[PDB]
Write a protein that binds this ligand. Structure first.
Ligand SMILES: CC(=O)N[C@H]1[C@H](O[C@@H]2[C@@H](O)[C@H](O)O[C@H](CO)[C@@H]2O)O[C@H](CO)[C@H](O)[C@@H]1O
Ligand SMILES: CC(=O)N[C@H]1[C@H](O[C@@H]2[C@@H](O)[C@H](O)O[C@H](CO)[C@@H]2O)O[C@H](CO)[C@H](O)[C@@H]1O
Ligand SMILES: CC(=O)N[C@H]1[C@H](O[C@@H]2[C@@H](O)[C@H](O)O[C@H](CO)[C@@H]2O)O[C@H](CO)[C@H](O)[C@@H]1O
Ligand SMILES: [Ca+2]
Ligand SMILES: [Ca+2]
Ligand SMILES: [Ca+2]
Lengths: 252, 253, 254
């Protein structure tokens, strides 16, 4: 059901803040879906995050700095004792300034035992940075393991460079046939992966040839460090000058 | 009111928190958020503060963000359940996480004078940083605190560049009269999470004037999260042999 | 320090979330995992100078997760500061998309440490591009206890805004007169950038008259600030320009 989605807590993709922790071995360190610990030693605590205050004001918040599309939240009870959360509300924030509630704060169905996971796919996927589970009803104690499942994210880095220029009365302004003027370009910083480059006109100064305009600009020899900006014309056209801006973007 | 419109980093779980030392497993940074309160009827859940284990002028709590922020303010508060608080501190920060810097060249910032009354420090100039640290310099009783950092809201963009969308040589714009269009569907390499805006501009032009007039255009139509229709066009009596464009599509948040 | 100079120390800079398989107890957790972490040697209650697992088997791990992709150059391993416990070999696993995971060297063991405090660096055969990375201890002395660091290339963060269809209007002022002539259209970005952007501003629609067979048209930003810029459309000489349209791309760094 969750194929192709990111398991946020399993991949350590969020910070976890809780309202309260029962003690130092019942914390959010123990909150991942299917977390299991040493069943022969009591000292490592609970197979769950468990609160210290038992009321309807507790919560665990997962925060991402990069916005995510949340598809599903999975809840699970406590692995080593009969404590589990039977319903909960979801709150979330995209800008980390205003918070909203899923279903206007209505309860979502939780679990009924220690280990059987209950997935909730949100009615509409939720676009958010931070998301919180607020237990509303429970068996025994407020104790849970959980996961959030998000669409995979993509990360880009873009560099813009302005005003790459042929010069006045450039080599395109004499001769005939295919002709080019090459201007090397160095990016401000080196990209981590090979960028794609858009390179488009902002200033055109050219002569038609039997009423035809023929002008072009294209990158060549694109690397992580820069590229060659190739201005060109062809046929009998005489082009005094061309200027272009570029946009270079690398992914992941 | 003073921090209205700003992001409360710790409250929003926007940073990782590393400490120099923790008194024990119930005095950790899990207890550090401003106004954190716990079970006052049970001792086992520990302090209403992060408390260090070593008491000297070398302790700290570091908040780390991967996405750069403009830090407006840091708020300090004492320990909720005992008379322990930090009376002055210094601030260090890093933008690139290689070089670190000291706010006010390491000079002291005024802290708090009681358990619960928050003292906000707005930085003399806002600090652009990824990571930021509070280094207690003086204290009452023990090095124990709750805190918050307040940043401007961040925006996140994702950009895709696509090169060389082309009409073809001697395209349909090279015949006829009036408004004429050649449509080239474009599919982005990946689907955006939200609707992008698209810039789509010329990189090669091969066209004939009409009574000395040049008339050429290119424009996206039907932009979705998956792609768009690249519409090349001319109008009036102009004949256009070919046009080429590159696009830049960016989605926010 | 010299061998990793100029690289980002992830844990030291609090750049990652840390998830462990198990923690011995609440004072043996990943809070104690940073390279060279040292604690109160006079008081036992603050625990170990290491993350120490609760289960001692080949299924333990510590995961470092970053939301922004990094180029991982090196992993440093260190033993426990306060007891004779350390990890003698381990495997490295990682993921870029946080869906599919991969094993470094097809899961072969990487050499760990031989004592409490002497750090052993492993520079990856090829730098690893990833979001999340995990240390899986394979062999150990005494217990599974470690301090560690990951070193990455510095990251750059950009924010980009695209705005479409900035227009002179039909039959604009460039369509009369002689000499250098400009039509200025102020542009406000949808949001204010945190730092000064660079701006690409390029044509998407051209409606102009040649002059003695010459085309002379231009567009350029002026007075770029964090909030916006003036879009300056222009011609010169005897050219008459009915209209010009442009799209912009503005990007701010760090
Ligand atoms: C390669 C090239 O020049 N193609 C252009 C085409 O040019 C042709 C010449 O190749 C041909 O020899 O003579 C023609 C007139 O007799 C014309 O110059 O011109 C096309 C527009 O009609 C188009 O501009 C091609 O770029
Ligand atoms: C709709 C159109 O083609 N507008 C262009 C305008 O074209 C005009 C025609 O509308 C009119 O019928 O006849 C005129 C010549 O008498 C001319 O063709 O021309 C403008 C430039 O002068 C501009 O190019 C408009 O785009
Ligand atoms: C300043 C200018 O308009 N430069 C363009 C140049 O214009 C020259 C004039 O400088 C000169 O005074 O007169 C010439 C005609 O007799 C011509 O207009 O023309 C260049 C192309 O040949 C280019 O367009 C310059 O931008
Ligand atoms: Ca420009
Ligand atoms: Ca191109
Ligand atoms: Ca456009």
């Amino acid at each position: 059901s969750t194929q192709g989605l990111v398991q946020l807590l399993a991949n350590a993709q969020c910070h976890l803040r809780t309202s309260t922790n029962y003690n130092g071995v019942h914390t959010q360190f123990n909150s991942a879906l299917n977390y299991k610990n040493n069943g022969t030693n009591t000292i490592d605590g609970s197979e769950a995050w468990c609160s210290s205050i038992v009321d309807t004001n507790q919560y665990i918040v997962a925060g991402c700095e990069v916005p995510r599309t949340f598809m599903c939240v999975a809840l699970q009870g406590r692995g080593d004792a009969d404590q589990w959360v039977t319903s909960y509300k979801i709150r979330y924030s995209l800008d980390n300034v205003s918070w909203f509630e899923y279903r206007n704060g209505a309860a979502v169905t939780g679990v009924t035992d220690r280990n059987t996971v209950v997935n909730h796919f949100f009615d509409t996927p939720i676009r958010a940075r931070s998301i919180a589970i607020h237990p509303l009803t429970w068996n025994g104690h407020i104790s849970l393991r959980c996961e959030f499942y998000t669409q995979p994210v993509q990360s880009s880095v873009t560099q813009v460079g302005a005003d790459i220029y042929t010069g006045d009365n450039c080599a395109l302004n004499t001769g005939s046939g295919k002709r080019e003027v090459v201007v090397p370009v160095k990016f401000q910083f080196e990209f981590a992966t090979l960028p794609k480059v858009a390179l488009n006109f902002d200033q055109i100064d050219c002569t038609d040839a039997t009423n035809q305009t023929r002008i072009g600009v294209q990158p060549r020899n694109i690397t992580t460090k820069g590229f060659d900006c190739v201005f060109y014309t062809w046929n009998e056209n005489k082009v005094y000058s061309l200027r272009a801006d570029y946009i270079a973007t690398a992914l992941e």
